[PDB]
Design an enzyme around this catalytic site. Structure first.
Site, PDB file in Angstrom:
ATOM      1  CB  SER A   1       2.850   2.196   6.289  1.00 15.37           C
ATOM      2  OG  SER A   1       1.451   1.689   6.733  1.00 15.37           O
TER       3      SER A   1
ATOM      4  CG  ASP B   1       0.094  -3.930   3.035  1.00 21.55           C
ATOM      5  OD1 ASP B   1       0.832  -3.333   2.031  1.00 21.55           O
ATOM      6  OD2 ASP B   1      -0.117  -3.134   3.981  1.00 21.55           O
TER       7      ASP B   1
ATOM      8  CG  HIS C   1      -0.332   0.224   2.550  1.00 18.52           C
ATOM      9  ND1 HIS C   1      -0.220   1.366   3.095  1.00 18.52           N
ATOM     10  CD2 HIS C   1      -0.124  -0.830   3.577  1.00 18.52           C
ATOM     11  CE1 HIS C   1       0.382   1.166   4.251  1.00 18.52           C
ATOM     12  NE2 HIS C   1       0.509   0.021   4.553  1.00 18.52           N
TER      13      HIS C   1
END
Ligand SMILES: [Ca+2]
Ligand SMILES: [Ca+2]
Ligand SMILES: [Ca+2]
Ligand SMILES: [Ca+2]
Ligand SMILES: [Ca+2]
Ligand SMILES: [Ca+2]
Ligand SMILES: [Ca+2]
Ligand code: NA
Ligand code: NA
Lengths: 223, 176, 223
Positions: free
Chosen positions: A177, A84, A40
């Site tokens: 992230s 992910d 992402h």
């Protein structure tokens, strides 16, 4: 990182950041030319920065290398965040040294309770927003799949695990992230998602890297 | 929690008659509420209405299981409460970059054909002063990416919102 | 439709859908070759589907016929949605039977308080999004001009009426557009517009079909 501590300049030498206009994700250097981060975090035109502590000052040990390839896992799903994981190839190999070094991939999966190091430049508040200058670090144990699944019913797949604290207070956060979750010298986790940060019974959720070690090898050897 | 102009927590739309807020610019001299400028089809530009112009009402929503109050740093769907043909929704999103008024930017838009299910995820971020916020635009609800801030662009005399731009801060004001 | 019930397979034989990869509007079959729907539902290359219950399945009582003509009313205004009616000619005549039947055009207008049936596959939630597999139905009274105009000041033309509940909870919604509003076996309404879904003091607004009976016939006769 919420409820962490200041790592210390270059004490996490595999920590990289992903840049386009600002710092938006972390990443982990797994060899001189490949970064592992979160799918992402995929962006066109990314610059990877290595050897940072204070992201807002040029300290002298940085290397800013463009991403030449960004290979998202082919089974990545952006709704569920299943799979992910992303591989970034650097345009040229990083110069490896004491402050820019790669982190080993796992040779088996980590079990519930394993203490890990999670790092990043993301938000340090759970009630608000504050973005740090220097790298922040968190020691957090991997949680049982049971409590993880219960925390997020119907949302945890076998490619995710939770780490942190059911009582809240310590967590990865917005801007962390793609960042590393390292347990006994191995990259076991990639910062992925959560419901807010550091909330009660809402631990952070992480890409289960030990599932991907073979896919990473093949991708590196074909690219 | 994100507070409104009165100091009360901003409530989410969890069904029934949902709570509504206008989004006012918190800049010193005058704000004018956020509103729409027709772009195309069911789509509009999010812009700041002239002063004394009422802004449009906005509902804030999130995935199931969410607690009923807007939380700092969290991500929500923004939706104008405005009359619309039923093929159109009113959710906000990050638009394709364009040039308009000699300005190149990615505008924040609102509304699209309902079936495309398009919307972005907006984040209220704190400011030095309580009840005054910066918006950020995300392409994900729960993922730990750091989203780009939303700012303002002077486009042919009108103040429009987009990714980046000029410093823009807001308050949430209850509606009705 | 929010706050309605499952119609039951084929209990609304005049309900059709308008498709372009997506089901994006309802419509009403007024005869073997003509569907009436909403002007804002216009799209080139519409496929009309008939005899459906579960739209995400071919159920084998269904018919799919291409629009050969999509005639938007010449005084349609896409800003005000005045004259929000459109006629669709089917490429080939629909096979009629118990599960695909035409609905009669009204011979005069209906009055305030009259009970009507509203149907469609649009959103069932006022908060968030949920699109039904099976057709949904709502029984709703036509409101007074007086309370209709008060609810949408300056926006209600003589070609629009309101139906629903001032207290909310029951209403048409995104995806129901073009759908039928049938009152005592006569098509008096086309699902048109509204502010939100099922909100207090914001009933659905419907194209007043009884204003168009003459125009509908002329259009049929010429095409
Ligand atoms: Ca350390
Ligand atoms: Ca970062
Ligand atoms: Ca390697
Ligand atoms: Ca690239
Ligand atoms: Ca190897
Ligand atoms: Ca609901
Ligand atoms: Ca055509
Ligand atoms: Na290992
Ligand atoms: Na959740």
């Amino acid at each position: 990182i919420v409820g962490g501590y200041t790592c210390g300049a270059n004490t996490v030498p595999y920590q990289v950041s992903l840049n386009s206009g600002y710092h938006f994700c972390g990443g982990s250097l797994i060899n001189s030319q490949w970064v592992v981060s979160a799918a992402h975090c995929y962006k066109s035109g990314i610059q990877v920065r290595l050897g940072e502590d204070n992201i807002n000052v040029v300290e002298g040990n940085e290397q800013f290398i463009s991403a030449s390839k960004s290979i998202v896992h082919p089974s990545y799903n952006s709704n569920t965040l299943n799979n992910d994981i992303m591989l970034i190839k650097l345009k040229s190999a990083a110069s490896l040294n004491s402050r820019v070094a790669s982190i080993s991939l796992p040779t088996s999966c980590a079990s519930a309770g394993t203490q890990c190091l999670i790092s990043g430049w993301g938000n340090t508040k759970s009630s608000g927003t504050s973005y740090p200058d220097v790298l922040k670090c968190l020691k957090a144990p991997i949680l049982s799949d049971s409590s993880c699944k219960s925390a997020y019913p119907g949302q945890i797949t076998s490619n995710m695990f939770c780490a942190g604290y059911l009582e809240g207070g310590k967590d990865s956060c917005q801007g962390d992230s793609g960042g590393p979750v390292v347990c006994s010298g191995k990259l076991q986790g990639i910062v992925s998602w959560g419901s807010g940060c550091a909330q009660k019974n809402k631990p952070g959720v992480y890409t289960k890297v030990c599932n991907y070690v073979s896919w990473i090898k093949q991708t590196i050897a074909s690219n | 929690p994100v507070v409104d102009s009165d100091g009360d927590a901003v409530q989410l739309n969890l069904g029934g008659n949902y709570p509504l807020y206008t989004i006012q610019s918190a800049a010193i001299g005058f704000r004018g509420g956020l509103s729409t400028l027709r772009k195309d089809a069911c789509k509009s530009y999010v812009y700041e209405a002239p002063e004394t112009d009422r802004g449009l009402p906005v509902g804030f929503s999130a995935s199931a299981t969410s607690q009923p109050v807007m939380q700092l740093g969290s991500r929500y769907k923004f939706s104008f409460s405005m009359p619309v043909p039923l093929i159109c929704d009113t959710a906000w999103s990050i638009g394709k970059s364009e040039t308009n008024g000699g300005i190149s930017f990615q505008p924040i838009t609102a509304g699209d054909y309902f079936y495309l299910n398009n919307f972005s995820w907006f984040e209220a971020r704190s400011t030095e002063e309580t009840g005054v916020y910066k918006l950020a635009a995300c392409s994900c609800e729960f993922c730990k990416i750091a989203c780009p801030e939303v700012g303002s662009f002077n486009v042919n005399g009108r103040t429009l919102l987009g990714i980046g731009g000029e410093h823009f801060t807001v308050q949430f004001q209850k509606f009705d």
